[PDB]
C-alpha cells in the first residue's frame, strides 16, 4: 500500500512517556497531526521570509531562533529557546 | 621513656615495586611546609591497601 | 546511531530534515535548524499534552476527546492568542454566560 | 569617604630631544619594542632617556588643511588627541607596519641624530618568544632597506633581564616574566635559555584590565557614565594585590570585619535588613544605600575583585584559559624535568631554585613575591633554600639587559647579524645563541 | 593659545617625505594589512607544510609547543555572580552560585542573553 507520512506514533509515545496511564483516539491523532504540520509550515515560512529579508541564503539556528522568539505570543517561547539551545548543545556534545 | 615519630600529610606518590611479592614502596607525603619522601616495608603497604589509601588522601 | 538519539531528542530529526530539503524553503540548510524545529515542536506538544492531561483528569476520562483540548486551549491566554483565529471542527463553546444576561 | 578617579593629567611640556653634537656613529642604539611602552636611547647611558607608550595620531587641522602627526608623549597634550591614540600592536604581534616606521622616525628625530644614507648605528632589539616568521622577515626588510643599519641582534626581554641580573652569563636560574599580554616561564641552564621547556600562559595586564572592564560592566549594568580604559588601568594599578591564600581569603572577605577596611569606593567624575544580605555587602559595601542620592549611584565598590583578578595568573580557569597555573607549570619544570626525579631534586634544579627571578611589566602588583615564595615552600622538598629576586622597577631591566650586553663586547659579537650575512642567507635565517630564539626544528 | 600650541608641536616635529633619516633608495612595495587572527593559522599551515614535506623531523620550539599544557589538578568551582565559592549550579541556565538569595533575585529573574557574557568570563558559553 501507500507509505503515508504521519508523526502520530511520536506524539503517541511522548503522551505515553509523560502520562503512562492515559488513552487516546484516532481523531485526536489526526487533529494534532493537523496542528504540527500547521505550525511546521508556518514557522518554516516565517524563517524563510526573514532570512530572505536579511538577504541570507541559508537556515541555521539563528534565523529560526529569532523566528521562534518573535512569532508565538509568550511563555512557550521562553521555555522553547532555552530547551532548543540545550538540545543543540547535546547534539554538538555528541 | 618512649618516643613518638609521626609523618602526616597528603599522599602525592604511591609507587610500589616487586621482586607478585612486593619488595617496598616509595611514599611521598606533602604538607604546607614542604614534602618528604619515604621508603616503606610491605606490611605497612598492606595496611595502606587495607585503609583504601589513594593519591591525594591525607 | 540515529541522529535524533545523538541529539537526545524524541521527535525525529531526519524526518524534518527530509521535509526541509524538498519543502522549498531555503536552498542551503544548516545542521542545527532541524534540531531546533524538533525541539520547539516537542515543547509545544509537551505543553498541550500536559494541558490535555489535566483536562482529562478534570473530566475524569482516560481518553482525551478533542473537547478536552478545547477547554485546555481556552484556559490560557497565550494559546487564546496563538489559536484564537483558528476554527476547530467539533469544538463547541466554552461555558461563558454574562452576569447581566442571567435573571435577577 | 569615597575617592574619585579621573584620567591621568596631560603633560604641560612636550618631550625634549637630545643635542645633535653629542651623537656619535660608533655607539649602538638600544630599542625595546614592548607591547605597552617604547624605550629608546644610547648604550653608554644607564638611566632612561625616552619612555613613552606606542601610539600615534593623525590630527587633521581645518585652517591649515594638513594632517599633523603626534607621537607618544606628544599625544599626551589634549584630551581629543589622547582619545584618538592608535597602538601598532594588534594582539600579541604587530600588523600595521607604516606606523612602526613613523614612530621609529620619531625616535630617530628625538635622539639627536644627524645621519647620512640611513642610520649608521647597529640596533639592539627585543622580540617575543617563538616569534612568527613574517614579522621578523618584515623587520629585516625595514631595517636592512629603510634605515641602512650595519648590524642587528635580537633576543627575549626576560632572558635579557636575567642576563642583566646575572652578568656572568653562565648562571642557572628560572625566570618568570609577566608581560602586558603574555606570561612566560623560561628555565635557564648555564646562562643559556632552555626554550624547549619554556611555557606561556595567555594572560597579561591587558587581559586583566579587560577583565576589570567587563566585570564592572556586569556588576553594574545600569551605570550611566561610561568610564575609559585609563580609569580601569589606574584602579587596577592602585587597588589590587595578590592574596596570600585564595582559598582562605575568599571565605572571610565578605564579613563586616573586613569590608570596613578592605573595601575601596571609587566615584565616577561628573558635573529585611541590609546587614544580613550579602548582595548589599557585595554591591554597596558595609554602608547603607540611598538610591535618591546623586553622588551615590556614581560609585564602584571593589571588595572581591582586588584579590580575584591577580588570581587568574595562578588559576587560568577563572579567565577562561584552559591552561595550568604558574605554580603548577613551575612544578612541572622543576620537579619532573632536567633530570630531576619527583622527590629527588637534581643539582640543576637546586641551582634553578636559588636564582628565581620575577620580571616584566605586571610584577608591580604587591604580594606576588610572598605568594610565589609560599607556593614554592609548599611544593618543594623541605630544607631547599628558595631565593626570589624582584627588581624595584621590573619594567626597565630589559634596557639594562641590552646595556650590559653591548657594554660586554666579548659576547656581543656572538649574537649580531650584519648586512652581509642577511644578504647571503636571506630573511630566512636563525642565529642560534644563548639569549634569543632558537630554530623552529631540530 | 590653546589652539595654537598644537601647531607649534606639529611644526616642531614636522617631517616630510624626503627626510634625512630613511635611506636614499626606497623600492617600497604595497603591503596587505594582515591582521593577527589569520597569522596563527598561517603559521599552522606553514608548519604543517614543513612536516608533510618532511614526511614524504621533530619540532623543537614553536608557538604551538611552548604553549601551556592544561591543568592536571581539578579547577576550583566559583560563583559567577559574586566571585565567591560556588556550591550550587542552576539547572535551567547553568550558572554556579554561592547561596540562596543570589539565586532568588539575580539568577532567577535575569534577562535572556545575559547568560552568554555572564559565562564568557570563564568561557563556558
From Swiss-Prot, chain A:
Monoubiquitination of Lys-90 by BRE1 gives a specific tag for epigenetic transcriptional activation and is also prerequisite for histone H3 'Lys-4' and 'Lys-79' methylation. GlcNAcylation at Ser-82 promotes monoubiquitination of Lys-90. It fluctuates in response to extracellular glucose, and associates with transcribed genes. It comes from the Eukaryota. GO terms for cellular component: nucleosome; nucleus. Keywords: Acetylation, Chromosome, DNA-binding, Glycoprotein, Isopeptide bond, Nucleosome core, Nucleus, Phosphoprotein, Ubl conjugation. There is a cross-link at residue 90 (Glycyl lysine isopeptide (Lys-Gly) (interchain with G-Cter in ubiquitin)). It is found in: Nucleus; Chromosome. Glycans are attached at residue 82. GO terms for molecular function: DNA binding; protein heterodimerization activity; structural constituent of chromatin. The keyword Phosphoprotein applies. The nucleosome is a histone octamer containing two molecules each of H2A, H2B, H3 and H4 assembled in one H3-H4 heterotetramer and two H2A-H2B heterodimers. The octamer wraps approximately 147 bp of DNA. Core component of nucleosome. Nucleosomes wrap and compact DNA into chromatin, limiting DNA accessibility to the cellular machineries which require DNA as a template. Histones thereby play a central role in transcription regulation, DNA repair, DNA replication and chromosomal stability. DNA accessibility is regulated via a complex set of post-translational modifications of histones, also called histone code, and nucleosome remodeling. This is Histone H2B 1.1.
From Swiss-Prot, chain B:
It comes from the Eukaryota. It is found in: Nucleus. DNA helicase which participates in several chromatin remodeling complexes, including the SWR1 and the INO80 complexes. The SWR1 complex mediates the ATP-dependent exchange of histone H2A for the H2A variant HZT1 leading to transcriptional regulation of selected genes by chromatin remodeling. The INO80 complex remodels chromatin by shifting nucleosomes. Its ability to induce transcription of some phosphate-responsive genes is modulated by inositol polyphosphates. The INO80 complex is involved in DNA repair by associating to 'Ser-129' phosphorylated H2A histones as a response to DNA damage. Probably forms a homohexamer. Interacts with RVB2 and may form heterododecamers with RVB2. Component of the SWR1 chromatin remodeling complex composed of at least ACT1, ARP4, RVB1, RVB2, ARP6, YAF9, VPS71, VPS72, SWC3, SWC4, SWC5, SWC7 and SWR1, and perhaps BDF1. Component of the chromatin-remodeling INO80 complex, at least composed of ARP4, ARP5, ARP8, RVB1, RVB2, TAF14, NHP10, IES1, IES3, IES4, IES6, ACT1, IES2, IES5 and INO80. Component of the R2TP complex composed of at least RVB1, RVB2, TAH1 and PIH1. Interacts with SPT15/TBP and HSP90. Belongs to the RuvB family. Present with 11600 molecules/cell in log phase SD medium.
Curated annotation (Swiss-Prot), chain D:
It comes from the Eukaryota. CDD domains: ASKHA_NBD_Arp5. SUPFAM superfamilies: Actin-like ATPase domain (SSF53067). GO terms for molecular function: enzyme regulator activity. GO terms for biological process: chromatin remodeling; DNA repair; regulation of DNA-templated transcription. Pfam families: Actin. The modification Phosphothreonine is found at residue 13. There is a cross-link at residue 1 (Glycyl lysine isopeptide (Lys-Gly) (interchain with G-Cter in ubiquitin)). InterPro entries: Actin, ATPase_NBD. One of its GO terms (cellular component) is nucleus. It is found in: Nucleus. Keywords: Isopeptide bond, Nucleus, Phosphoprotein, Transcription, Transcription regulation, Ubl conjugation. Present with 2170 molecules/cell in log phase SD medium. Belongs to the actin family. Probably involved in transcription regulation via its interaction with the INO80 complex, a chromatin remodeling complex. Component of the chromatin-remodeling INO80 complex, at least composed of ARP4, ARP5, ARP8, RVB1, RVB2, TAF14, NHP10, IES1, IES3, IES4, IES6, ACT1, IES2, IES5 and INO80. This is Actin-related protein 5. It comes from Saccharomyces cerevisiae (strain ATCC 204508 / S288c). The lineage of its organism: Eukaryota, Fungi, Dikarya, Ascomycota, Saccharomycotina.
From Swiss-Prot, chain E:
One of its GO terms (biological process) is chromatin remodeling. One of its GO terms (cellular component) is nucleus. It comes from the Eukaryota. The keyword Aminoacyl-tRNA synthetase does not apply. Coiled coil: none annotated. Keywords: Nucleus, Transcription, Transcription regulation. Disulfide bonds: none annotated. It is found in: Nucleus. Belongs to the IES6 family. Present with 1720 molecules/cell in log phase SD medium. Probably involved in transcription regulation via its interaction with the INO80 complex, a chromatin remodeling complex. Also involved in the regulation of telomere length. Component of the chromatin-remodeling INO80 complex, at least composed of ARP4, ARP5, ARP8, RVB1, RVB2, TAF14, NHP10, IES1, IES3, IES4, IES6, ACT1, IES2, IES5 and INO80. This is Chromatin-remodeling complex subunit IES6. It comes from Saccharomyces cerevisiae (strain ATCC 204508 / S288c). The gene is IES6.
Amino acid at each position: 500500500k501507500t507509505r503515508k507520512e504521519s508523526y502520530a506514533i511520536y506524539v503517541y509515545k511522548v503522551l505515553k512517556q509523560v502520562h503512562p496511564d492515559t488513552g487516546i483516539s484516532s481523531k485526536a491523532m489526526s487533529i494534532m497531526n493537523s496542528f504540527v504540520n500547521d505550525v511546521f509550515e508556518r514557522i518554516a515560512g516565517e524563517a524563510s521570509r526573514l532570512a530572505h529579508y536579511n538577504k541570507r541564503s541559508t537556515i541555521t539556528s539563528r534565523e529560526i531562533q529569532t523566528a521562534v522568539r518573535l512569532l508565538l505570543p509568550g511563555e512557550l517561547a521562553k521555555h522553547a529557546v532555552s530547551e532548543g539551545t540545550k538540545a543543540v548543545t547535546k547534539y554538538t556534545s555528541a | 621513656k618512649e618516643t613518638k615519630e609521626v609523618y602526616e600529610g597528603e599522599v602525592t606518590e604511591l609507587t610500589p615495586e616487586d621482586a607478585k611479592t612486593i619488595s617496598h614502596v616509595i611514599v611521598g607525603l606533602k604538607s604546607a611546609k614542604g614534602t618528604k619522601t619515604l621508603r616503606l616495608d610491605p606490611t605497612i603497604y598492606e595496611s595502606i591497601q587495607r585503609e583504601k589509601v589513594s593519591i591525594g588522601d591525607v | 546511531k540515529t541522529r535524533s538519539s545523538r541529539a537526545g531528542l524524541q521527535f525525529p530529526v531526519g524526518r524534518v530534515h527530509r521535509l526541509l530539503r524538498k519543502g522549498n524553503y531555503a536552498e542551503r540548510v544548516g545542521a542545527g535548524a532541524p534540531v531546533y524545529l524538533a525541539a520547539v515542536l516537542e515543547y509545544l506538544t509537551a505543553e498541550i499534552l500536559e494541558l490535555a492531561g489535566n483536562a482529562a483528569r478534570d473530566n475524569k476520562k482516560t481518553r482525551i476527546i478533542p473537547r478536552h483540548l478545547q477547554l485546555a486551549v481556552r484556559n490560557d491566554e497565550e494559546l487564546n492568542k496563538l489559536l484564537g483565529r483558528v476554527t476547530i471542527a467539533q469544538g463547541g463553546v466554552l461555558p461563558n454566560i454574562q452576569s447581566v444576561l442571567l435573571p435577577k | 569617604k569615597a575617592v574619585v578617579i579621573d584620567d591621568p593629567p596631560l603633560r604641560q611640556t612636550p618631550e625634549p630631544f637630545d643635542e645633535q653634537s653629542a651623537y656619535n656613529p660608533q655607539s649602538p642604539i638600544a630599542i625595546d619594542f614592548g607591547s605597552s611602552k617604547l624605550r629608546a636611547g644610547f648604550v653608554n647611558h644607564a638611566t632612561p632617556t625616552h619612555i613613552f607608550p606606542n601610539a600615534l595620531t593623525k590630527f587633521r587641522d581645518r585652517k591649515l588643511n594638513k594632517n599633523f602627526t603626534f607621537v607618544g608623549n606628544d599625544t599626551l597634550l589634549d584630551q581629543a588627541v589622547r582619545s584618538q591614540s592608535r597602538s601598532p600592536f594588534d594582539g600579541p604581534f604587530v600588523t600595521n607596519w607604516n606606523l612602526t616606521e613613523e614612530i621609529l622616525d620619531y625616535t630617530f628625530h628625538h635622539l639627536g641624530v644627524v645621519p647620512d644614507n640611513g642610520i649608521p648605528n647597529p640596533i639592539l632589539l627585543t622580540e617575543r618568544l617563538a616569534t612568527v616568521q613574517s614579522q621578523r622577515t618584515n623587520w629585516y626588510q625595514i631595517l636592512f632597506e629603510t634605515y641602512n643599519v650595519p648590524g642587528v641582534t635580537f633576543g627575549i626581554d626576560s632572558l635579557f633581564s636575567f642576563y642583566n641580573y646575572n652578568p656572568s652569563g653562565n648562571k642557572t636560574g628560572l625566570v618568570i616574566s609577566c608581560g602586558h599580554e603574555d606570561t612566560n616561564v623560561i628555565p635557564v641552564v648555564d646562562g643559556a635559555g632552555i626554550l624547549t621547556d619554556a611555557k606561556r600562559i595567555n594572560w597579561g595586564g591587558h587581559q586583566a584590565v579587560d577583565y576589570l572592564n567587563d566585570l564592572m560592566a556586569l556588576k553594574y549594568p545600569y551605570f550611566p557614565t561610561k568610564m575609559s580604559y585609563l580609569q580601569y588601568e589606574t584602579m587596577y594599578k592602585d587597588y589590587c594585590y595578590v592574596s596570600r591564600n585564595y582559598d582562605e581569603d575568599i571565605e572571610k572577605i565578605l564579613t563586616l570585619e573586613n569590608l570596613d577596611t578592605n573595601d575601596v569606593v571609587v566615584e565616577a567624575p561628573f558635573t529585611y535588613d541590609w546587614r544580613n544580605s550579602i548582595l548589599h555587602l557585595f554591591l554597596r559595601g558595609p554602608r547603607p544605600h540611598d538610591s535618591e542620592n546623586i553622588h551615590e549611584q556614581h560609585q564602584m565598590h571593589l571588595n572581591v575583585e582586588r584579590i580575584r583578578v591577580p588570581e587568574v595568573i595562578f588559576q587560568p580557569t577563572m579567565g577562561g584559559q584552559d591552561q595550568a597555573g604558574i605554580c603548577e607549570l613551575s612544578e612541572t619544570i622543576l620537579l619532573k624535568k632536567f633530570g630531576s626525579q619527583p622527590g629527588k631534586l637534581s643539582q640543576t634544579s637546586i641551582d634553578m631554585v636559588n636564582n628565581v627571578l620575577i620580571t616584566g611589566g605586571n610584577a608591580k602588583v604587591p604580594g606576588l613575591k610572598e605568594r610565589i615564595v609560599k607556593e614554592f615552600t609548599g611544593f618543594l622538598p623541605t630544607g631547599t633554600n628558595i631565593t626570589v629576586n624582584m627588581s624595584s622597577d621590573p619594567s626597565l631591566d630589559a634596557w639594562k639587559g641590552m646595556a650590559a650586553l653591548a657594554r660586554n663586547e666579548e659576547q656581543y659579537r656572538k649574537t649580531v647579524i650584519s648586512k652581509k650575512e642577511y644578504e647571503e642567507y636571506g630573511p630566512e635565517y636563525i642565529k642560534e645563541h644563548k639569549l634569543g630564539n632558537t630554530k623552529y626544528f631540530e | 593659545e590653546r589652539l595654537l600650541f598644537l601647531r607649534s608641536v606639529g611644526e616642531r616635529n614636522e617631517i616630510g617625505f624626503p627626510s634625512r633619516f630613511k635611506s636614499a633608495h626606497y623600492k617600497k612595495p604595497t603591503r596587505r594589512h594582515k591582521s593577527a587572527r589569520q597569522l596563527i593559522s598561517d603559521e599552522n599551515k606553514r608548519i604543517n607544510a614543513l612536516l608533510t614535506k618532511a614526511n614524504k623531523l621533530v619540532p623543537k620550539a614553536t608557538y604551538f609547543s611552548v604553549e601551556a599544557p592544561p591543568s592536571i589538578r581539578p579547577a576550583k568551582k566559583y560563583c559567577d555572580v559574586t566571585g565567591l565559592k560556588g556550591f550550587y549550579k542552576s539547572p535551567t541556565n547553568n550558572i554556579r552560585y554561592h547561596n540562596a538569595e543570589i539565586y532568588q533575585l539575580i539568577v532567577k529573574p535575569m534577562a535572556p542573553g545575559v547568560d552568554q557574557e555572564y559565562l564568557k568570563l570563564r568561557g563556558a558559553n
